[PDB]
């Protein structure tokens, strides 16, 4: 299975990207399997605020790389982020602030968990699915 690794928050960027101090060096982390609207787009500020509150108020920050590629073409770390035990990726999808997207076979461990959260967000007509 995968493993959670500790890290510390430098600053929240937007809905699906956060700057973290990972093993002594700053790194921008892009959330796996999700896509939040840009800050300039509808639900973008809400998505940003959500992720921002989760990571800033969190005592325990953890990153969890999947079984494949760890960085993308933009130099961003690819992982699942946890704030006090709760997965940020999943929480965003459950609230309808992020759509399940960029699902690559190499990094798809929590795919079902997230698609289940998205289907429920859809049923409740939340935010992007309203
Ligand atoms: C989430 C994720 C995104 N990406 C790339 C796909 C997209 O590239 P292209 O834009 O070149 O298509 C980009 C989407 O990022 P953003 O949603 O931050 O724009 O990041 C990965 O390569 N792997 C991943 O796991
Ligand atoms: Ca995005």
From Swiss-Prot:
Q: Where is this region: Disordered?
A: 110-130
Q: Where is the active site?
A: 30, 38, 76
What is the protein's species of origin? Staphylococcus aureus
Source domain of life is Bacteria
Ligand binding (Ca(2+)): 16, 35-36
Localization annotation: Secreted
Coiled-coil region list = none
Give residue spans, biased composition: Basic and acidic residues. 110-126
Which cysteines are disulphide-bonded?
Answer: none
Span covered, complete protein: 88 to 223 of 231
Kindly provide the name given to this protein in its UniProt entry: Nuclease A
């Amino acid at each position: 299975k995968l493993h959670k690794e500790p890290a510390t928050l430098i600053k929240a960027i937007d809905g699906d990207t956060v700057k973290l101090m990972y093993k002594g060096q700053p790194m921008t982390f892009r959330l796996l399997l999700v896509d939040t609207p840009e800050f300039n787009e509808k639900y973008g500020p809400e998505a940003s605020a959500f992720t921002k509150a989760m990571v800033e108020n969190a005592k325990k920050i953890e990153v969890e790389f999947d079984k494949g590629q760890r960085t993308d073409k933009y130099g961003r770390g690819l992982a699942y982020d946890y704030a006090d035990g709760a997965m940020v990726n999943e929480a965003l999808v459950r609230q309808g602030l992020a759509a399940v997207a960029y699902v690559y076979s190499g990094n798809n461990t929590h795919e079902q968990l997230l698609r289940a959260a998205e289907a429920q967000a859809k049923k409740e007509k939340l935010n992007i699915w309203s």
